[PDB]
Amino acid sequence: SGFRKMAFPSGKVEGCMVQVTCGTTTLNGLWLDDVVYCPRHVICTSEDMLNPNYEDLLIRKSNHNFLVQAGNVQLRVIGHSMQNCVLKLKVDTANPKTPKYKFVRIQPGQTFSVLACYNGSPSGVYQCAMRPNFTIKGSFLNGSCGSVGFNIDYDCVSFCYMHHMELPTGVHAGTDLEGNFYGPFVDRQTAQAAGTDTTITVNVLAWLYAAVINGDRWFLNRFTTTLNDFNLVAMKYNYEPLTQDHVDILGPLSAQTGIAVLDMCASLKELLQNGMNGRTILGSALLEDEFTPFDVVRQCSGVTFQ
């Protein structure tokens, strides 16, 4: 029993974190096999950030301008290239701690663990979600650039995020491991702002199914709804539209608890109208949206507490 915001064990990623330095700038890199991946803005000064010409900045660098430190050992850079917004530094040593891995690009609503790092050293691990507006609500201080987001499946690490920047509202933006940004963001200090954020409806439904599995049913009602009427109400509370894909994805949780997806949608409509009236759901007074259907199935018991 219980339900916590749980991260994957970070050990497999901790053995890949290194420090990358270019001139006065120091940030984190991810060392996998003989390549170190890091944000390309490591080659910029603060002045370069308004309108950096990364190609022009990079051509002026040699391999020996990049200092890569793995623990207390200096790695030798033998090649460099830029791919989108990521710099790939070929090094003369393959990481002996390289786990079984993959690079995956995720969609909004997906969750992942973040290993916050500073100077190539891990400080903490936390769980978060790719918001519908393509930002993440992280906890990142200066020096955290290059920290990565990941999921683990059977000893295989799927890297999905690399941290690049903090936006004016305090939220965070980054790229996949091929250097493509999530969202309409760019690695320059120009006027950029996150779009209006919304609640991840399919995740709130998954978390209501988690509450039922753990024994709580107070929020259920005798009603059902059509998918269209649910969306018309949900959109008024700044909730993302619920698609037939989301309904299909909730199928297993619906079968385990005996509560139809549209019947759980009716419960959500009522919670949005009434609030919680002093009650909590899984120890929260707000509707939680950073647990996916897959996270709920992974964490919860396969036996509902009837």
φ and ψ at 185, to 5 degrees?
Answer: -90, 155
From the list Cl ion, ligand S3X, a copy of itself, none, pick the one residue 137 interacts with, judged by a Cβ distance below 5 to 8 Å according to partner type.
a copy of itself
Looking at 29-37, 81-89, 124-132, 265-273, which segment touches a copy of itself (CB under 8 A)? Answer: 124-132
When asked if residue 283 is in the footprint of a copy of itself (CB under 8 A), the reply is: yes
Instruction: Give the contact letters, 157-186, x = binds to ligand S3X (CB under 6 A), - = no.
Output: -------xxx-x---x--------------
Could you say which of 170, 184, 195, 258 contacts a copy of itself (CB under 8 A)? 170
Contacts of 174 (CB under 8 A, 6+ apart): 136, 149, 161, 162, 163, 164, 165, 181, 182
Q: Look at residue 189 and give the partner it binds from Cl ion, ligand S3X, a copy of itself, none, a contact being a CB closer than 5 to 8 Å depending on partner kind.
A: ligand S3X
Is the Cβ of residue 48 or residue 229 nearer to ligand S3X in the bound state? 48
Considering CB distances under 5 to 8 angstroms, the limit depending on partner class, which of Cl ion, a copy of itself, ligand S3X, none binds residue 197?
Answer: none
The set of residues, in sequence order, having a beta carbon less than 8 Å from that of 283 and lying 6+ positions away, is 3
| 247, HSE (Cβ side, Cα atoms, 13 Å) | 15
193 binds a copy of itself (CB under 8 A): no
Cα–Cα dist 175/12, whole Å: 20
Binders in 40-59 for ligand S3X, by CB under 6 A: 41, 49
**Shortest approach of ligand S3X to residue 2 CB, angstroms?**
8
Q: Which is nearer to Cl ion, 246 or 269 (CB)?
A: 246
DSSP string, 221-289: -S----HHHHHHHHGGGTBPPPPHHHHHHTHHHHHHHT--HHHHHHHHHHHHHH--TT--BTTBSS---
Tokens 């939680």 belong to 288
| Contact pick of 176, 187, 289, 295 for ligand S3X (by CB under 6 A) | 187
β-strands 86-91, 100-103: how paired? unpaired
Kindly identify the residues of this chain, within the stretch 135-164, that bind a copy of itself according to CB under 8 A: 137-141, 143-144
Is 41 annotated as catalytic? Answer: yes
DSSP letter string, 180-222: PBSSS--SSSSS--PPPP-B-HHHHHHHHHHHHHTT--TT--S
CB atoms closer than 10 angstroms to residue 102: 13
Residues 232-271 binding a copy of itself (CB under 8 A) are none
Whether residue 34 contacts residue 94, with contact meaning beta carbons closer than 8 Å, is answered with yes
Window 17-76: residues binding a copy of itself (CB under 8 A): none
Q: Catalytic residue numbers? A: 41, 145
Q: Which residues here bind ligand S3X, judged by CB under 6 A?
A: 1, 41, 49, 140-142, 144-145, 164-166, 168, 172, 187-189, 305
